[PDB]
């Protein structure tokens, strides 16, 4: 009944494999197709998102082969025909893949990943790519949003124990680091990704002794960097005075980094703890806070003048608790016709704004040459290049009466070649290079788009040709449905 | 900087390893300890939860060794001392593990997993166990909640593309099957767990032809079991009439299972589609619905008399969207003292109901002998056995004036031995045996606890001894904090 978990290649919806069989049997498996990945709404109503997922998807695509167990399952249980199974057994990835790079700013209603190649191959990878990219982009963006209210204070990601299974913890904490976290608690993530790892002790150490002083002394005898968790019994009356006593007794034999509070009304507690430390002469000791924190509670605490220096965030960051899915989709936007020419494809819905934008596209980030001012993104059909134009017309695709002519601009294409016909041409950067790239992209975005409260809407505009092309196909399908009925 | 991902053993918080070092260096690593896992609030305000995670945690514990890369990272990057590293290098799991079984009903404020053994070893496994069990139990419970409003209609889990990374998709869909899903879309989950797999085609097949009739015929030529997705262009005007045409032309050469609708106002659309099918003579063809469904929208659709037969649920099930974390914790409840006897441990907080219940405990499910009526769970210290008692006193631990004397009962211990001193004594059941066990446990629960709307609160009561013991330790700690201040 069950087979070895030795492969990601069947980490896919059954729809995909059934469609692949249909194409293969009818000799259409090698029709040239273009698919694009995008999301429709800004996550958390944030002003921007931070792209993550590329390293993951690169590893997946470079190892995309059907194993013996994969094929045996499809044969023995699902009863797929032998002939199709030999096609799968000889499968090797031959699609072109273009993508935003990790740490790039991305927005809704623009392509983030584009896959072009044989129809059957494009179909196979959709599910896995969405599974990876949806989550990783969501968490990087949540981390940016939290780091934005914190400013230069450290943000520590401590949510492994509450994450949605193992991959979510390790890849989520990596995304958080890209987004704006400064360290993780997760040692494996440190090992395999090179993220800085932090954390001293938990309540169990203190309970193992039955008192704060002896546990803190035990920790201080065996470690140089000391942060004491003070709320096992009583923060103000037991924990903090015990911490102070240990720090005085040990002197320069430890680094007394500070104390951690993990409960209570943090604004009032942090103020009194700050006073106890300062009165004892420990004016450089820091206060670390954890416990159900997110951007909302952190902003409030800081606006209440809490005396918190370091923020540990777990559950609400690692699960993106208030919106735990980004909603990215993959759609067919162009397909080879019987005449061997590309035909742009559309899918309708009740919503006339939720209709797919057809055609193979590029996304151009427009910046003013003078002062690098963010002008927005400009989405074109593949054949247009705004670098070759003196002037472009940017209009809101719904509210078309909102518009500007833009001159003296630079235009950067966001989708970059990663694989050309299955062959990798992009060298993977180090995680620190990704984090720096995110920082530089954010530093370059105008403040109005970057704030957590009521950010302005970053323009994502379709070119006149792309927009007219969309409306023309929409009208043609509408007319065809009419002819069919009557 | 970075090492091979060959091990789960460092999938842990750094706190754990730092505490382990402290214990080891001070010769307390082998102190006998007891930890218990529990959650504090019912997920989704549901009447019960369904336990999942045991197979996963068993696999993890049976392979818990420090690899060469694990140790090299701890040495070269974190700079742990060689002596401690040799302890880790020779580590083998020697803890006793007791647990609810997968498919067991579980509730808040009772131990679900108990680990007993050397203090340092218990500390290592906490983080990973919570990461696995939190998620898996949450999704099984969400699936039960959704299946409860569906009744005998099939529930199909289709959320892989929106899940929080890969493990979440495969282990989440397994949990959903245990909970109440009837099939998955995820082929790998089918391969490695034996879950039934389902799904026909997506919009891309239809767009590849540019019309419904030709795509449906293509699918019908190459497959026997046909469900046609009808909403690419126009459900009522194009899709459904095309489906009907294909079904008439193919006759008994296919199984026309029905049509899928993935958009629009499903209540009105399903009624008209039902009429079109029936008027054409296809009174047995089913209507499949997908698109942002959960228990709330499904109950509403069914109460509006929607003509939907099969339900596909993705995002909201696989991510537990309205509450994406269960909130399970691990706490030290007893520790060996200097005299070699066990000392029960407590941790306080601002909340006097959020104080940990000390001691090694068992959970007894109480049922009336006559009619199997659910009387609740009865949590005792380890030394009590209600099977040996004619009468037990069950009282609400806060509202103590709510109480009953229970006689003529059966009492079943929920925590079962899985590992004895690191050695497995529990044979793992098949997934179908787990699903059946959940079904039988649910069939045995009284309807008042099982309904989705305002379920009654299932009693979880502490025995008189366990409750008095808790209050006595609380008072002692309170008195000790007083003596310390003044
Ligand atoms: Cl640290
Ligand atoms: Cl810490
Ligand atoms: Cl005070
Ligand atoms: Cl999609
Ligand atoms: Cl099916
Ligand atoms: Cl289907
Ligand atoms: Cl009609
Ligand atoms: Cl915990």
PDB file of C-alpha atoms in Angstrom, chain A residues 58-289:
ATOM      1  CA  UNK A  58      15.759  25.915  -7.207  1.00  0.00           C
ATOM      2  CA  UNK A  59      16.656  22.880  -5.080  1.00  0.00           C
ATOM      3  CA  UNK A  60      13.333  21.256  -5.926  1.00  0.00           C
ATOM      4  CA  UNK A  61      13.682  21.831  -9.720  1.00  0.00           C
ATOM      5  CA  UNK A  62      17.317  20.630  -9.873  1.00  0.00           C
ATOM      6  CA  UNK A  63      16.236  17.330  -8.297  1.00  0.00           C
ATOM      7  CA  UNK A  64      12.957  16.888 -10.164  1.00  0.00           C
ATOM      8  CA  UNK A  65      13.062  13.230 -11.293  1.00  0.00           C
ATOM      9  CA  UNK A  66      10.575  10.404 -10.892  1.00  0.00           C
ATOM     10  CA  UNK A  67      12.024   7.734  -8.612  1.00  0.00           C
ATOM     11  CA  UNK A  68      11.421   3.996  -8.763  1.00  0.00           C
ATOM     12  CA  UNK A  69       9.013   4.260  -5.815  1.00  0.00           C
ATOM     13  CA  UNK A  70       7.190   7.202  -7.475  1.00  0.00           C
ATOM     14  CA  UNK A  71       6.544   5.127 -10.592  1.00  0.00           C
ATOM     15  CA  UNK A  72       5.731   1.918  -8.666  1.00  0.00           C
ATOM     16  CA  UNK A  73       3.051   3.813  -6.716  1.00  0.00           C
ATOM     17  CA  UNK A  74       1.559   5.301  -9.880  1.00  0.00           C
ATOM     18  CA  UNK A  75       1.557   1.841 -11.496  1.00  0.00           C
ATOM     19  CA  UNK A  76       0.459  -0.424  -8.671  1.00  0.00           C
ATOM     20  CA  UNK A  77      -2.016   1.804  -6.792  1.00  0.00           C
ATOM     21  CA  UNK A  78      -3.265   4.501  -9.174  1.00  0.00           C
ATOM     22  CA  UNK A  79      -2.999   2.188 -12.214  1.00  0.00           C
ATOM     23  CA  UNK A  80      -1.623   4.747 -14.685  1.00  0.00           C
ATOM     24  CA  UNK A  81      -0.825   3.193 -18.115  1.00  0.00           C
ATOM     25  CA  UNK A  82       2.695   1.904 -18.733  1.00  0.00           C
ATOM     26  CA  UNK A  83       3.267   4.113 -21.725  1.00  0.00           C
ATOM     27  CA  UNK A  84       2.632   7.347 -19.761  1.00  0.00           C
ATOM     28  CA  UNK A  85       4.757   5.941 -16.913  1.00  0.00           C
ATOM     29  CA  UNK A  86       7.738   5.583 -19.250  1.00  0.00           C
ATOM     30  CA  UNK A  87       7.311   9.230 -20.226  1.00  0.00           C
ATOM     31  CA  UNK A  88       7.448  10.096 -16.492  1.00  0.00           C
ATOM     32  CA  UNK A  89      10.401   7.714 -15.919  1.00  0.00           C
ATOM     33  CA  UNK A  90      12.430   9.514 -18.649  1.00  0.00           C
ATOM     34  CA  UNK A  91      11.275  12.989 -17.543  1.00  0.00           C
ATOM     35  CA  UNK A  92      13.822  15.750 -17.267  1.00  0.00           C
ATOM     36  CA  UNK A  93      13.028  19.387 -16.516  1.00  0.00           C
ATOM     37  CA  UNK A  94      13.298  21.567 -19.644  1.00  0.00           C
ATOM     38  CA  UNK A  95      11.354  24.741 -18.733  1.00  0.00           C
ATOM     39  CA  UNK A  96      12.557  28.300 -18.634  1.00  0.00           C
ATOM     40  CA  UNK A  97      11.956  29.861 -15.200  1.00  0.00           C
ATOM     41  CA  UNK A  98      12.033  33.603 -14.496  1.00  0.00           C
ATOM     42  CA  UNK A  99      11.503  35.019 -10.984  1.00  0.00           C
ATOM     43  CA  UNK A 100      11.817  37.899  -8.634  1.00  0.00           C
ATOM     44  CA  UNK A 101      14.955  37.365  -6.476  1.00  0.00           C
ATOM     45  CA  UNK A 102      14.743  36.718  -2.741  1.00  0.00           C
ATOM     46  CA  UNK A 103      14.703  40.051  -0.872  1.00  0.00           C
ATOM     47  CA  UNK A 104      12.994  41.827  -3.813  1.00  0.00           C
ATOM     48  CA  UNK A 105       9.952  43.901  -3.004  1.00  0.00           C
ATOM     49  CA  UNK A 106       6.866  42.432  -4.664  1.00  0.00           C
ATOM     50  CA  UNK A 107       3.277  43.514  -4.907  1.00  0.00           C
ATOM     51  CA  UNK A 108      -0.184  42.223  -5.812  1.00  0.00           C
ATOM     52  CA  UNK A 109      -1.426  41.730  -9.403  1.00  0.00           C
ATOM     53  CA  UNK A 110       2.006  41.377 -10.990  1.00  0.00           C
ATOM     54  CA  UNK A 111       3.813  38.209 -12.044  1.00  0.00           C
ATOM     55  CA  UNK A 112       6.393  37.049  -9.488  1.00  0.00           C
ATOM     56  CA  UNK A 113       7.415  33.771 -11.134  1.00  0.00           C
ATOM     57  CA  UNK A 114       7.014  32.816 -14.776  1.00  0.00           C
ATOM     58  CA  UNK A 115       7.409  29.353 -16.212  1.00  0.00           C
ATOM     59  CA  UNK A 116       7.650  28.736 -19.945  1.00  0.00           C
ATOM     60  CA  UNK A 117       8.117  25.464 -21.771  1.00  0.00           C
ATOM     61  CA  UNK A 118       6.365  22.186 -22.562  1.00  0.00           C
ATOM     62  CA  UNK A 119       2.783  22.301 -21.276  1.00  0.00           C
ATOM     63  CA  UNK A 120       2.977  18.992 -19.374  1.00  0.00           C
ATOM     64  CA  UNK A 121       6.151  20.006 -17.510  1.00  0.00           C
ATOM     65  CA  UNK A 122       4.795  23.411 -16.411  1.00  0.00           C
ATOM     66  CA  UNK A 123       1.723  21.641 -15.063  1.00  0.00           C
ATOM     67  CA  UNK A 124       3.799  19.344 -12.786  1.00  0.00           C
ATOM     68  CA  UNK A 125       5.606  22.033 -10.780  1.00  0.00           C
ATOM     69  CA  UNK A 126       2.747  24.482 -10.004  1.00  0.00           C
ATOM     70  CA  UNK A 127       1.564  22.924  -6.748  1.00  0.00           C
ATOM     71  CA  UNK A 128       4.959  22.565  -5.071  1.00  0.00           C
ATOM     72  CA  UNK A 129       6.104  26.043  -6.079  1.00  0.00           C
ATOM     73  CA  UNK A 130       2.980  27.623  -4.582  1.00  0.00           C
ATOM     74  CA  UNK A 131       3.333  25.569  -1.376  1.00  0.00           C
ATOM     75  CA  UNK A 132       6.916  26.893  -0.922  1.00  0.00           C
ATOM     76  CA  UNK A 133       6.640  30.460  -2.169  1.00  0.00           C
ATOM     77  CA  UNK A 134       3.287  31.321  -0.600  1.00  0.00           C
ATOM     78  CA  UNK A 135       4.520  30.578   2.877  1.00  0.00           C
ATOM     79  CA  UNK A 136       8.041  31.961   2.625  1.00  0.00           C
ATOM     80  CA  UNK A 137       6.954  35.301   1.161  1.00  0.00           C
ATOM     81  CA  UNK A 138       4.199  35.632   3.755  1.00  0.00           C
ATOM     82  CA  UNK A 139       6.595  35.204   6.695  1.00  0.00           C
ATOM     83  CA  UNK A 140       9.340  37.469   5.287  1.00  0.00           C
ATOM     84  CA  UNK A 141       6.677  40.159   4.892  1.00  0.00           C
ATOM     85  CA  UNK A 142       5.303  39.627   8.423  1.00  0.00           C
ATOM     86  CA  UNK A 143       8.861  39.931   9.821  1.00  0.00           C
ATOM     87  CA  UNK A 144       9.392  43.227   7.940  1.00  0.00           C
ATOM     88  CA  UNK A 145       6.130  44.531   9.344  1.00  0.00           C
ATOM     89  CA  UNK A 146       7.129  43.694  12.910  1.00  0.00           C
ATOM     90  CA  UNK A 147      10.726  44.951  12.478  1.00  0.00           C
ATOM     91  CA  UNK A 148       9.303  48.238  11.139  1.00  0.00           C
ATOM     92  CA  UNK A 149       7.708  49.102  14.536  1.00  0.00           C
ATOM     93  CA  UNK A 150      10.739  47.861  16.502  1.00  0.00           C
ATOM     94  CA  UNK A 151      13.317  50.039  14.689  1.00  0.00           C
ATOM     95  CA  UNK A 152      16.945  49.240  15.639  1.00  0.00           C
ATOM     96  CA  UNK A 153      16.038  47.012  18.646  1.00  0.00           C
ATOM     97  CA  UNK A 154      16.808  43.312  18.075  1.00  0.00           C
ATOM     98  CA  UNK A 155      14.010  41.033  16.897  1.00  0.00           C
ATOM     99  CA  UNK A 156      14.407  37.408  17.890  1.00  0.00           C
ATOM    100  CA  UNK A 157      12.283  34.698  16.146  1.00  0.00           C
ATOM    101  CA  UNK A 158      11.374  32.055  18.829  1.00  0.00           C
ATOM    102  CA  UNK A 159       8.282  30.326  17.261  1.00  0.00           C
ATOM    103  CA  UNK A 160       9.498  26.800  16.305  1.00  0.00           C
ATOM    104  CA  UNK A 161       7.397  25.080  18.997  1.00  0.00           C
ATOM    105  CA  UNK A 162       4.180  26.671  17.565  1.00  0.00           C
ATOM    106  CA  UNK A 163       4.959  26.400  13.811  1.00  0.00           C
ATOM    107  CA  UNK A 164       2.978  24.399  11.293  1.00  0.00           C
ATOM    108  CA  UNK A 165       5.274  21.368  11.250  1.00  0.00           C
ATOM    109  CA  UNK A 166       9.019  21.141  10.712  1.00  0.00           C
ATOM    110  CA  UNK A 167       9.618  22.747   7.301  1.00  0.00           C
ATOM    111  CA  UNK A 168       7.561  25.751   8.377  1.00  0.00           C
ATOM    112  CA  UNK A 169       9.828  26.283  11.391  1.00  0.00           C
ATOM    113  CA  UNK A 170      13.165  26.142   9.495  1.00  0.00           C
ATOM    114  CA  UNK A 171      12.141  27.849   6.234  1.00  0.00           C
ATOM    115  CA  UNK A 172       9.896  30.290   8.112  1.00  0.00           C
ATOM    116  CA  UNK A 173      12.677  31.359  10.435  1.00  0.00           C
ATOM    117  CA  UNK A 174      14.964  31.834   7.402  1.00  0.00           C
ATOM    118  CA  UNK A 175      12.287  34.013   5.784  1.00  0.00           C
ATOM    119  CA  UNK A 176      11.889  35.975   9.014  1.00  0.00           C
ATOM    120  CA  UNK A 177      15.648  36.655   9.026  1.00  0.00           C
ATOM    121  CA  UNK A 178      15.405  37.938   5.449  1.00  0.00           C
ATOM    122  CA  UNK A 179      12.387  40.029   6.370  1.00  0.00           C
ATOM    123  CA  UNK A 180      13.813  41.673   9.460  1.00  0.00           C
ATOM    124  CA  UNK A 181      14.503  39.257  12.301  1.00  0.00           C
ATOM    125  CA  UNK A 182      18.032  39.461  13.737  1.00  0.00           C
ATOM    126  CA  UNK A 183      18.318  35.926  15.103  1.00  0.00           C
ATOM    127  CA  UNK A 184      16.542  32.598  15.565  1.00  0.00           C
ATOM    128  CA  UNK A 185      16.150  30.171  18.458  1.00  0.00           C
ATOM    129  CA  UNK A 186      16.226  27.230  16.070  1.00  0.00           C
ATOM    130  CA  UNK A 187      19.645  25.565  16.172  1.00  0.00           C
ATOM    131  CA  UNK A 188      19.148  23.490  12.991  1.00  0.00           C
ATOM    132  CA  UNK A 189      18.242  26.666  11.069  1.00  0.00           C
ATOM    133  CA  UNK A 190      21.517  28.134  12.319  1.00  0.00           C
ATOM    134  CA  UNK A 191      23.364  24.977  11.233  1.00  0.00           C
ATOM    135  CA  UNK A 192      21.988  24.682   7.714  1.00  0.00           C
ATOM    136  CA  UNK A 193      21.314  28.344   6.797  1.00  0.00           C
ATOM    137  CA  UNK A 194      23.886  30.259   8.873  1.00  0.00           C
ATOM    138  CA  UNK A 195      21.373  32.401  10.756  1.00  0.00           C
ATOM    139  CA  UNK A 196      22.604  33.709  14.166  1.00  0.00           C
ATOM    140  CA  UNK A 197      21.176  31.632  17.016  1.00  0.00           C
ATOM    141  CA  UNK A 198      20.191  32.991  20.438  1.00  0.00           C
ATOM    142  CA  UNK A 199      18.582  31.982  23.726  1.00  0.00           C
ATOM    143  CA  UNK A 200      19.706  31.348  27.289  1.00  0.00           C
ATOM    144  CA  UNK A 201      17.349  29.401  29.570  1.00  0.00           C
ATOM    145  CA  UNK A 202      13.685  28.530  30.172  1.00  0.00           C
ATOM    146  CA  UNK A 203      11.546  28.200  33.342  1.00  0.00           C
ATOM    147  CA  UNK A 204      12.432  24.499  33.746  1.00  0.00           C
ATOM    148  CA  UNK A 205      16.031  25.355  34.814  1.00  0.00           C
ATOM    149  CA  UNK A 206      14.654  27.556  37.592  1.00  0.00           C
ATOM    150  CA  UNK A 207      12.029  24.967  38.665  1.00  0.00           C
ATOM    151  CA  UNK A 208      14.768  22.267  38.719  1.00  0.00           C
ATOM    152  CA  UNK A 209      16.348  24.168  41.653  1.00  0.00           C
ATOM    153  CA  UNK A 210      13.135  25.560  43.173  1.00  0.00           C
ATOM    154  CA  UNK A 211      14.579  29.076  43.352  1.00  0.00           C
ATOM    155  CA  UNK A 212      15.814  31.882  41.151  1.00  0.00           C
ATOM    156  CA  UNK A 213      19.152  32.609  42.826  1.00  0.00           C
ATOM    157  CA  UNK A 214      20.509  29.068  42.639  1.00  0.00           C
ATOM    158  CA  UNK A 215      19.364  28.557  39.008  1.00  0.00           C
ATOM    159  CA  UNK A 216      20.838  31.879  37.887  1.00  0.00           C
ATOM    160  CA  UNK A 217      24.120  31.096  39.681  1.00  0.00           C
ATOM    161  CA  UNK A 218      24.152  27.669  38.000  1.00  0.00           C
ATOM    162  CA  UNK A 219      23.691  29.329  34.603  1.00  0.00           C
ATOM    163  CA  UNK A 220      26.318  32.001  35.416  1.00  0.00           C
ATOM    164  CA  UNK A 221      28.878  29.346  36.497  1.00  0.00           C
ATOM    165  CA  UNK A 222      28.533  27.528  33.164  1.00  0.00           C
ATOM    166  CA  UNK A 223      28.024  30.409  30.647  1.00  0.00           C
ATOM    167  CA  UNK A 224      29.513  33.817  29.930  1.00  0.00           C
ATOM    168  CA  UNK A 225      26.514  35.532  28.232  1.00  0.00           C
ATOM    169  CA  UNK A 226      23.755  35.761  30.825  1.00  0.00           C
ATOM    170  CA  UNK A 227      20.105  36.699  30.287  1.00  0.00           C
ATOM    171  CA  UNK A 228      18.085  35.599  33.316  1.00  0.00           C
ATOM    172  CA  UNK A 229      14.369  34.708  32.954  1.00  0.00           C
ATOM    173  CA  UNK A 230      12.865  36.277  36.062  1.00  0.00           C
ATOM    174  CA  UNK A 231       9.146  35.432  36.121  1.00  0.00           C
ATOM    175  CA  UNK A 232       9.048  31.815  37.323  1.00  0.00           C
ATOM    176  CA  UNK A 233       7.695  32.805  40.771  1.00  0.00           C
ATOM    177  CA  UNK A 234       7.605  36.588  41.127  1.00  0.00           C
ATOM    178  CA  UNK A 235       9.320  38.986  38.762  1.00  0.00           C
ATOM    179  CA  UNK A 236       9.625  41.999  41.052  1.00  0.00           C
ATOM    180  CA  UNK A 237      10.028  40.287  44.386  1.00  0.00           C
ATOM    181  CA  UNK A 238      12.079  37.175  43.580  1.00  0.00           C
ATOM    182  CA  UNK A 239      13.484  37.096  40.028  1.00  0.00           C
ATOM    183  CA  UNK A 240      14.959  40.526  39.452  1.00  0.00           C
ATOM    184  CA  UNK A 241      16.543  40.859  42.935  1.00  0.00           C
ATOM    185  CA  UNK A 242      18.055  37.386  42.442  1.00  0.00           C
ATOM    186  CA  UNK A 243      19.438  38.352  39.046  1.00  0.00           C
ATOM    187  CA  UNK A 244      20.980  41.485  40.531  1.00  0.00           C
ATOM    188  CA  UNK A 245      22.549  39.452  43.319  1.00  0.00           C
ATOM    189  CA  UNK A 246      24.153  37.004  40.882  1.00  0.00           C
ATOM    190  CA  UNK A 247      25.450  39.808  38.667  1.00  0.00           C
ATOM    191  CA  UNK A 248      27.067  41.550  41.682  1.00  0.00           C
ATOM    192  CA  UNK A 249      28.670  38.356  42.952  1.00  0.00           C
ATOM    193  CA  UNK A 250      30.037  37.299  39.554  1.00  0.00           C
ATOM    194  CA  UNK A 251      31.231  40.749  38.448  1.00  0.00           C
ATOM    195  CA  UNK A 252      33.357  40.672  35.273  1.00  0.00           C
ATOM    196  CA  UNK A 253      33.344  36.862  35.148  1.00  0.00           C
ATOM    197  CA  UNK A 254      30.058  37.080  33.189  1.00  0.00           C
ATOM    198  CA  UNK A 255      28.418  39.407  30.692  1.00  0.00           C
ATOM    199  CA  UNK A 256      25.198  40.366  32.449  1.00  0.00           C
ATOM    200  CA  UNK A 257      23.215  41.112  29.254  1.00  0.00           C
ATOM    201  CA  UNK A 258      19.976  41.517  31.218  1.00  0.00           C
ATOM    202  CA  UNK A 259      16.694  39.928  32.208  1.00  0.00           C
ATOM    203  CA  UNK A 260      13.762  38.424  30.330  1.00  0.00           C
ATOM    204  CA  UNK A 261      10.095  38.905  31.196  1.00  0.00           C
ATOM    205  CA  UNK A 262       7.614  36.471  29.612  1.00  0.00           C
ATOM    206  CA  UNK A 263       4.325  37.415  31.332  1.00  0.00           C
ATOM    207  CA  UNK A 264       2.234  40.100  33.041  1.00  0.00           C
ATOM    208  CA  UNK A 265       1.369  43.608  31.921  1.00  0.00           C
ATOM    209  CA  UNK A 266       4.652  44.306  30.198  1.00  0.00           C
ATOM    210  CA  UNK A 267       4.389  48.099  30.103  1.00  0.00           C
ATOM    211  CA  UNK A 268       4.080  48.473  33.910  1.00  0.00           C
ATOM    212  CA  UNK A 269       6.431  45.580  34.733  1.00  0.00           C
ATOM    213  CA  UNK A 270       9.158  46.811  32.350  1.00  0.00           C
ATOM    214  CA  UNK A 271       9.120  50.288  33.974  1.00  0.00           C
ATOM    215  CA  UNK A 272       9.558  48.944  37.495  1.00  0.00           C
ATOM    216  CA  UNK A 273      12.221  46.398  36.402  1.00  0.00           C
ATOM    217  CA  UNK A 274      14.080  49.239  34.646  1.00  0.00           C
ATOM    218  CA  UNK A 275      14.096  51.135  37.957  1.00  0.00           C
ATOM    219  CA  UNK A 276      15.330  48.141  39.988  1.00  0.00           C
ATOM    220  CA  UNK A 277      18.218  47.509  37.594  1.00  0.00           C
ATOM    221  CA  UNK A 278      19.193  51.191  37.433  1.00  0.00           C
ATOM    222  CA  UNK A 279      19.010  51.645  41.238  1.00  0.00           C
ATOM    223  CA  UNK A 280      21.389  48.682  41.655  1.00  0.00           C
ATOM    224  CA  UNK A 281      23.836  50.288  39.186  1.00  0.00           C
ATOM    225  CA  UNK A 282      23.052  48.016  36.214  1.00  0.00           C
ATOM    226  CA  UNK A 283      22.086  50.796  33.821  1.00  0.00           C
ATOM    227  CA  UNK A 284      23.388  48.876  30.794  1.00  0.00           C
ATOM    228  CA  UNK A 285      21.509  45.626  31.559  1.00  0.00           C
ATOM    229  CA  UNK A 286      18.728  45.131  28.976  1.00  0.00           C
ATOM    230  CA  UNK A 287      15.115  44.041  29.331  1.00  0.00           C
ATOM    231  CA  UNK A 288      14.028  41.233  26.989  1.00  0.00           C
ATOM    232  CA  UNK A 289      10.291  40.643  26.463  1.00  0.00           C
TER     233      UNK A 289
END
